[PDB]
Design a protein around this ligand. Structure first.
Ligand SMILES: Cc1noc(C)c1C(=O)NCCC1CCCCC1
Length: 460
């Protein structure tokens, strides 16, 4: 029975509005409703992994697990295995997988982050799950961010706190936050970004939604505008939105948006918005294709509609050679030529690099680079031809070309990372000098760039 080189992943996000679900929720897991929907001919084909994020979830873990498993059983005639479940307040994540994957899944981690201080600590934050699927690391974050049209900056701060403090994946990757720890990272939830148009335009917005004319609304979506201005979710992807706003509905129908200010809303307007979202970030040159992104039309117990997204994701096998794991393969090497970091920092410490990869027995520290002044004020750290030759555990090109090198640039004075990035080994050629490049981030914000050349030697 061969190991897969691709899997499909279902991502669901639903703010349940503190109400129990209706009897039937199969449309969610079938990617049926509005937007980019799944072909009917696929309805009986199970996804490999289902990741369900809820917010304002009033159910116990047991109660929701029974509903989810019975739903998937009805669709697929497969009894799915529970990988992980984790709840913070009323924010929950469930990971289910086909039984055939049980011995492919390992290193399961869960964590949560509580956002805010005092007043604003007690119901918002995030839960997450990570695991290895054969040779591929997968991370999943369900966040419920701060509500209200005039709090986009708070939502951005919630995002930065979650990616800094959520402790998932390989703890040995100490310089790296969740935005670098996984081959594929999916971040979803009630992100609570709104369509920023004047209150007086509510009926105009409703009109546009009825005509399925979303362009003038999406051009005011706060998540899209904040992402374009590099204020949040830097280096993440989102499929194009082709479904109606998923908030705020009158319950028990989808015919009416309930936007007017009420005591129950704190006298705030809730103009129709795309609160409920799925984004992802995958390592460079790894296969990831969104095959659905939409909302259900027939699940009406909440003031939000459920959102679905599905993905094809490339995965690799748990590789064994005669040599690695447990030794090097002298026939393999990774060389860096003419490398330099450009940093936005005002500081003047010396810097060194760390190279982290599961193709190495352990991480590799470089010598300090040579600081120069860049023309337009910047710090340039030159490594020249000084970088250590990296010795992978396996030399087979079928393994090595699928790997990635994480890079941290660290202060000699404090040993703190000033920037993190990632280089793919999926090169156009081996034994050939080729340009490499990554942006560098810290706490998910841009701090610099790393560029140079690579020379990869495989056993072929
Ligand atoms: C989808 C769906 N949603 O609700 C219901 C009920 C279904 C359904 O009929 N599933 C049958 C699954 C089968 C397995 C493989 C081929 C034979 C059929």
């Amino acid at each position: 029975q061969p190991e897969p080189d691709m899997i499909t992943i279902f991502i669901g996000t639903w703010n349940m509005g503190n109400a129990p679900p209706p009897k039937k929720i199969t449309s969610w897991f079938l990617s049926k409703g509005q937007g980019k929907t799944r072909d009917d001919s696929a309805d009986y084909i199970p996804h490999d992994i289902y990741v369900i994020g809820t917010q304002e979830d009033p159910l116990s873990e047991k109660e929701w697990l029974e509903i989810l498993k019975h739903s998937l059983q009805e669709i697929t005639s497969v009894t799915f295995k529970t990988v992980a479940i984790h709840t913070l307040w009323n924010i929950r994540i469930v990971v289910l997988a086909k039984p055939e994957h049980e011995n492919r899944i390992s290193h399961i981690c869960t964590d949560n982050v509580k956002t805010g201080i005092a007043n604003t600590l007690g119901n918002k934050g995030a839960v997450g799950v990570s695991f290895m699927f054969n040779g591929t690391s997968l991370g999943f974050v369900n966040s419920h961010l701060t509500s209200g049209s005039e709090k986009k900056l708070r939502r951005n701060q919630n995002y930065m706190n979650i990616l800094r403090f959520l402790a998932l994946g390989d703890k040995k990757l100490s310089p790296f936050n969740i935005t670098h720890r996984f081959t594929h990272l999916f971040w979803f939830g009630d992100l609570n970004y709104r369509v920023d148009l004047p209150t007086w335009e509510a009926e105009t917005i409703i009109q546009k939604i009825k005509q399925q004319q979303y362009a003038d609304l999406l051009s005011h979506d706060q998540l899209l505008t904040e992402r374009r201005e590099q204020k949040v979710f830097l280096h993440f992807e989102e499929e194009e939105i082709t479904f109606a706003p998923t908030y705020r509905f009158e319950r028990l129908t989808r015919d009416k948006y309930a936007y007017t200010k009420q005591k129950a809303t704190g006298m705030k307007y809730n103009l129709p918005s795309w609160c409920d979202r799925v984004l992802w970030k995958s390592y460079p040159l790894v296969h990831v294709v969104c095959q659905s992104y939409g909302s259900t039309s027939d699940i009406m117990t909440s003031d939000h509609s459920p959102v679905f997204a599905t993905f094809e994701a490339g995965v690799t096998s748990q590789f064994v050679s005669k040599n690695g794991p447990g030794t090097v393969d002298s026939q393999g090497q990774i060389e860096f030529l003419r490398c330099y970091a450009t940093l936005k920092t005002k500081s003047q410490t010396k810097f060194y690099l760390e190279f982290h990869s599961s193709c190495l027995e352990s991480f590799v520290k470089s010598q300090e680079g040579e600081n120069e002044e860049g023309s337009e004020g910047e710090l340039v750290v030159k490594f020249g031809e000084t970088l250590p030759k990296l010795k992978p555990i396996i030399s087979d090109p079928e393994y090595l070309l699928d790997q990635h090198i994480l890079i941290s640039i660290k202060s000699s004075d404090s040993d703190e990372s000033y920037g993190e990035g990632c280089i793919a080994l999926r090169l156009e050629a081996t034994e050939t000098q080729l340009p490499i490049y990554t942006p560098l981030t810290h706490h998910g914000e841009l701090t610099g760039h790393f560029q140079g050349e690579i020379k990869l030697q495989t056993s072929q």
